[PDB]
Every structure is written in C-alpha cells, then in structure tokens.
C-alpha cells in the first residue's frame, strides 16, 4: 500500500508536469506563428514597394 501511494504520487506529478510543458509549447508555437506572420507581412510589403517602384 505504501509503495502504491508513492508511485501514484509520482505519476500524478508527472501528469501535471507534462500538462505544464504542453501549455508552454503551445505558447511558444503561438509566438512562432506570430513571428512567421510578421515575416510574411514584411516580405509582402517589400514586394509591394518593389512592384510600385518598378511600375512607378
């Protein structure tokens, strides 16, 4: 019974830790999505300036 309690406690902590890690990776994935949007927008604006200047 004592060993079962110990193992259950460690497994519960492991579940909590993996939940925290999954939330953290969600946050960082969202941040990378935002920065990818930033690069898309800046490249699009540079292309717009290029086409405006080449087309006067």
């Amino acid at each position: 019974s004592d060993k079962l309690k110990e193992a259950e406690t460690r497994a519960e902590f492991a579940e909590r830790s993996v939940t925290k890690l999954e939330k953290s990776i969600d946050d960082l994935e969202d941040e990378l999505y935002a920065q990818k949007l930033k690069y898309k927008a800046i490249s699009e604006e540079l292309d717009h300036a290029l086409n405006d200047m080449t087309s006067i």
Partner: protein, 55 residues
C-alpha cells in the same frame, strides 16, 4: 517599409515635374522657332517686292 516609400514618392514627384517642364520648354522652342522662320520668310518676300519696285 515606411520612409522608403515616401522617399520614392518624392523622387517621383521630382520626376514628373522635371519631365513636364522639359516637354513644355521643348514645345516653346518649337513654337518660337516657327515664329522666327515665318518672319524671316516675310522679310524675304518684302525684299523681292522691293526688288520689283526698284525695277
């Protein structure tokens, strides 16, 4: 970006104004030279008429 576009627009406004002024000056030169040459032809005809009167 942002300032680059505005600077390009300034460089284009200068382009349009300079080109328009050049074209207008060229038209002015054409008109003025045509005026001068027609006056010279009138002068020539007057010389010939004077010659006939002298005869």
């Amino acid at each position: 970006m942002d300032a680059i576009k505005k600077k390009m627009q300034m460089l284009k406004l200068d382009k349009e104004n300079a080109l328009d002024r050049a074209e207008q000056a060229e038209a002015d030169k054409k008109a003025a030279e045509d005026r001068s040459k027609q006056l010279e032809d009138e002068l020539v005809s007057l010389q010939k008429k004077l010659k006939g009167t002298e005869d």
